[PDB]
Design an enzyme around this catalytic site. Structure first.
Site, mmCIF file in Angstrom:
data_model
loop_
_atom_site.group_PDB
_atom_site.id
_atom_site.type_symbol
_atom_site.label_atom_id
_atom_site.label_comp_id
_atom_site.label_asym_id
_atom_site.label_seq_id
_atom_site.Cartn_x
_atom_site.Cartn_y
_atom_site.Cartn_z
ATOM 1 N N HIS A 478 73.034 5.196 -11.021
ATOM 2 C CA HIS A 478 72.804 5.710 -12.355
ATOM 3 C C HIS A 478 73.111 4.637 -13.400
ATOM 4 C CE1 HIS A 478 74.195 8.586 -15.669
ATOM 5 N NE2 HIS A 478 72.875 8.650 -15.652
ATOM 6 N N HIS A 483 70.425 2.639 -16.709
ATOM 7 C CA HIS A 483 70.920 2.291 -18.042
ATOM 8 C C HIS A 483 71.052 0.805 -18.277
ATOM 9 C CE1 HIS A 483 72.289 6.317 -19.439
ATOM 10 N NE2 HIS A 483 72.058 6.552 -18.161
ATOM 11 N N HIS A 669 65.282 7.495 -13.181
ATOM 12 C CA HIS A 669 66.469 7.941 -13.909
ATOM 13 C C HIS A 669 66.575 9.459 -13.912
ATOM 14 C CE1 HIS A 669 68.214 9.610 -17.600
ATOM 15 N NE2 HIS A 669 69.228 8.833 -17.266
ATOM 16 N N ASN A 673 69.792 11.560 -12.515
ATOM 17 C CA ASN A 673 70.608 12.027 -13.611
ATOM 18 C C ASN A 673 70.676 13.538 -13.712
ATOM 19 O OD1 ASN A 673 72.078 11.402 -16.188
ATOM 20 N ND2 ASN A 673 70.518 12.834 -16.897
ATOM 21 N N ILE A 818 69.546 9.927 -22.083
ATOM 22 C CA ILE A 818 70.893 10.525 -22.008
ATOM 23 C C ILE A 818 71.523 9.967 -20.741
ATOM 24 C CG2 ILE A 818 70.253 12.492 -20.712
ATOM 25 C CD1 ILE A 818 73.027 12.396 -23.374
#
Ligand SMILES: [Fe+3]
Length: 818
Positions: A478, A483, A669, A673, A818
């Site tokens: 993650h 990110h 993602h 997530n 997010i």
């Protein structure tokens, strides 16, 4: 002779967490010609023209949007407008959406899509410029616009110096030296991650607050971590500012929770499994001053339900929504490695035993101690099992072994490095058959058992595995792979591709809110004594552990087929539509993902050819070459020498790079997530830490294990206080904001003038609605319930494209939002 224009904008108050002041001489626009140039070749500039009046008679308007009339004087000498300057003379900033010019050019209407904050004109070294929505590779840029195009790029890049301020729009790189807080305390110092071969790491967006007092290498603290202003997303509704929730949690809520445990107002540890299920049934009871510090905060207050005085109740995780106990089964334990929160680490096994690549001089013989004769393979022999490709593993041994000693010295952390052996049964479900628990410098094999102290030891062994997987998922699957790895591409895009560029328009929607959440994460999630450090096993070694894994990160291995093949779970097969044959036929993440992959591939292959006809065109795009050169050489600079980086000299290269970036930002993602709370909301299913090694025969810990297995578990996994903080964190991360932009969508439908690109994008949106139907069918196909639904009866919807707001367990956003 006049041109009628309409300006749509949003005043400030509408996007936070008096309309006639816009009239008069407060806001000026000046059009810029695309066809007539002055002496020095630049588009001729019109006169300062001011907003004339409000335009309530417009039906397309959205919430918070106001429209304004304006009329430009534009005579025969001036040509066709292709750009415009705007100057805000107000003291307050406003958010400019668009300018629409009626009936002037060949296409009639000229549309400017702006979506940009416009601060007072005195704050800007150069005047804000906006272009019409036509797409131009650099060589096709109308000559009177060429110089503006480059000048705005130079402006976005800055000069590499200075403290960045709120209204700055300057994109640049820096290392992760802003996580430690040594000026506060020497115990909060952290290694600089990036720019060395010890701790390679992707770059992040430069902020320029300058050095701390005690360490010149570490950047000093700040109340606000800058992002370039248009990355800092406003929201109509304060409940959609999910990104600021994590900040409130660490600064306000966690210190509040910490008081309730210091004052002994609630029991300091869970004591049964029921104590945990209570969290989402009768709520936990808390002091009034703690609830009164929490319930008024926006976003935070949406997480829990409460009576105002003493209760906080969490929502019910999807995983206990049908069976409270199915998580405890070996089948779900196994199923979640292919249809869970972290479905992308399992590897196929082709030799037995598995071997370590670690240095035996430092760790010992690391040949696995698991014997072939101790496994129950449903009647298969080992040779048969290997040869029919039925053996698999979750191997965390080499990843965690170099840190086990360090972690195990801390006060409330004990772990092993684990391996899990899995067998693919004839019915198509995975079966766990052994778990090896290794220490460096005892290191035991544990075998399934359903009765006796042995079944409790097995349960605990499964918890150590999942502690391993939780740390790896959060920091690697993650944080690193989505990110962190994506931020450098964001920076490079804004620095080197003009808003005019076809590839800019293709990629930027898949960046929305990325730089913003990372900034807030650097401040509150992954900082020293931040939320990850205080809730996950490795404490202060968490982020530096991701630097070790990044040493082996490979951009081209992020493509889904390349990844399946690399991990031994698929084989290349040109007789399949997707080109790979899955070794686990019914692998929900990979099977669903391959449909999403292919649909994205089709969109990219239909789009690039609209602007690039030959490999020559790719090689000769100066902006595209500069972008890709910088992304590799600066943004991922510590891996710039590696041979696997695409070269970007061919059409095929361009398609591959764009496809990988979009895959990472959207579906990859989303798949890792949005299951976080649905599966991990029950702390026993996804423990974030372990606190002791297995009890030794002939100790009261051992006796407890025999008498109370529930207490031996809870005493081993994440304590109660970190559990509350971490459930809150992942409940936020698992929530879709109402203003999300999902895959196949865009915020503005006139993002380009090219009717061809618009139709290719319409076909993409359809293909996704189609796929979403195919995936609904699979979840209803009763042959696939073994893996898609499992004993917890939770259909695999994480890769459904569409979704509504909330904690929905589905929906693929465009970006890492997010
Ligand atoms: Fe995320």
């Amino acid at each position: 002779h006049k041109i009628k224009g309409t300006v749509v904008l949003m005043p400030k108050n509408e996007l936070e967490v008096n309309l006639n002041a816009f009239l008069g001489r407060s806001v000026s626009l000046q059009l810029i010609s695309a066809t007539k140039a002055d002496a020095h070749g630049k588009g001729k500039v019109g006169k300062d023209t001011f907003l004339e009046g409000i335009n309530t008679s417009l039906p397309t308007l959205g919430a918070g949007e106001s429209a304004f009339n304006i009329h430009f004087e534009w005579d025969g000498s001036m040509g066709i407008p292709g750009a415009f300057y705007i100057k805000n003379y107000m003291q307050v900033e406003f958010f400019l959406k668009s300018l629409t010019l009626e009936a002037i050019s060949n296409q009639g209407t000229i549309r400017f899509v702006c979506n940009s904050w416009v601060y007072n004109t005195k704050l800007y070294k150069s005047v804000r410029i906006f272009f019409a929505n036509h797409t131009y590779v650099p060589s096709e840029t109308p000559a009177p616009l060429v110089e503006y195009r480059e000048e705005e790029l130079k402006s976005l890049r800055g000069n590499g110096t200075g403290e960045r301020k709120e209204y700055d729009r300057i994109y640049d790189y820096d290392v992760y030296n802003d996580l430690g807080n040594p000026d506060k305390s020497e115990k909060l110092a952290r290694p600089v991650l990036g720019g060395s071969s010890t701790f390679p790491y992707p770059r992040r967006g430069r902020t320029g607050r300058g050095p701390t007092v005690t360490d010149p290498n570490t950047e000093k603290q700040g109340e606000v971590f800058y992002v370039p202003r248009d990355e800092n997303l406003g929201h109509l509704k304060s409940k959609d500012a999910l990104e600021i929730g994590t900040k409130s949690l660490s600064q306000i809520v966690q210190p509040a929770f910490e008081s309730a445990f210091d004052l002994k107002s609630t029991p300091i540890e869970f004591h049964s499994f029921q104590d945990v299920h209570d969290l989402y049934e009768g709520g936990i009871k808390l002091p009034r001053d703690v609830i009164s510090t929490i319930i008024p905060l926006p976003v935070i207050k949406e997480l829990y339900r409460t009576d105002g005085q003493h209760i906080l109740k969490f929502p019910q995780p999807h995983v206990v929504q049908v069976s409270q106990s199915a998580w405890m089964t070996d089948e779900e334990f196994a199923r979640e490695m292919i249809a869970g929160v972290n479905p992308c680490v399992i590897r196929g096994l082709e030799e037995f035993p598995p071997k370590s690549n670690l240095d035996p001089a430092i760790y010992g013989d690391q040949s696995s101690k698991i014997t072939a004769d101790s496994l129950d393979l449903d009647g298969y022999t080992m040779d048969e099992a290997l040869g029919s490709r039925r053996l698999f593993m979750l191997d965390y041994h080499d990843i965690f072994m170099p840190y086990v000693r360090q972690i195990n010295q801390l006060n409330s952390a004990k772990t092993y490095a684990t391996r899990t052996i899995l067998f693919l049964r004839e019915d198509g479900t995975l079966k766990p058959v052994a778990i090896e628990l290794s220490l460096p410098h005892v290191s035991q094999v544990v075998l399934p058992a359903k009765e006796g102290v042995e079944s409790t030891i097995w349960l605990l062994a499964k918890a150590y595995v999942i502690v391993n997987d939780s740390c790896y998922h959060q920091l690697m699957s993650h944080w690193l792979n989505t990110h962190a790895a994506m931020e450098p591409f964001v920076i490079a895009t804004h620095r080197h591709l003009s808003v005019l560029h076809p590839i800019y328009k293709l990629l930027t929607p898949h960046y929305r809110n990325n730089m913003n959440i990372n900034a807030l994460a650097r401040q509150s999630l992954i900082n020293a004594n931040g939320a990850i450090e205080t809730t996950f096993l490795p404490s202060k070694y968490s982020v530096e552990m991701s630097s070790a894994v990044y040493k082996n990160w490979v951009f081209t291995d992020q493509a889904l087929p390349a990844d399946l093949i690399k991990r031994g779970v698929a084989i290349k097969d040109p007789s399949t539509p997707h080109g790979v044959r899955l070794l686990i036929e019914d692998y929900p993440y990979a099977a669903d993902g391959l449909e999403i992959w292919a649909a994205i591939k089709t969109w990219v292959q239909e789009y690039v050819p609209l602007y690039y006809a030959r490999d020559d065109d790719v090689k000769n795009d100066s902006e595209l070459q500069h972008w890709w050169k910088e992304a590799v050489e600066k943004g991922h600079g510590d891996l710039k020498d590696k041979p696997w980086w695409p070269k970007l000299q061919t059409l095929e290269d361009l398609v591959e790079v764009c496809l990988i970036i979009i895959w990472i930002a959207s579906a990859l993602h989303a798949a890792v997530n949005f299951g976080q709370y649905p599966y991990g909301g029950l702390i026993m299913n996804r423990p974030t830490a372990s606190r002791r090694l297995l009890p030794e025969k002939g100790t009261p810990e051992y006796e407890e294990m025999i008498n109370n297995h529930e207490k031996a578990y809870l005493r081993t996994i994440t304590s109660k206080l970190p559990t509350l903080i971490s459930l809150s964190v992942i409940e936020i991360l698992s929530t879709h904001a109402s203003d999300e932009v999902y895959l196949g969508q865009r915020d503005n439908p006139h993002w380009t003038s090219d009717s061809k690109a618009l139709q290719a994008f319409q076909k993409f949106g359809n293909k996704l609605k189609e796929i979403e139907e195919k995936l609904v069918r699979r979840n209803n196909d009763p042959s696939l319930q073994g893996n898609r639904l499992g004993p917890v009866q939770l259909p695999y919807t994480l890769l459904y494209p569409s979704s509504e707001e909330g904690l929905t367990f589905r929906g693929i956003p465009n970006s890492i939002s997010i």
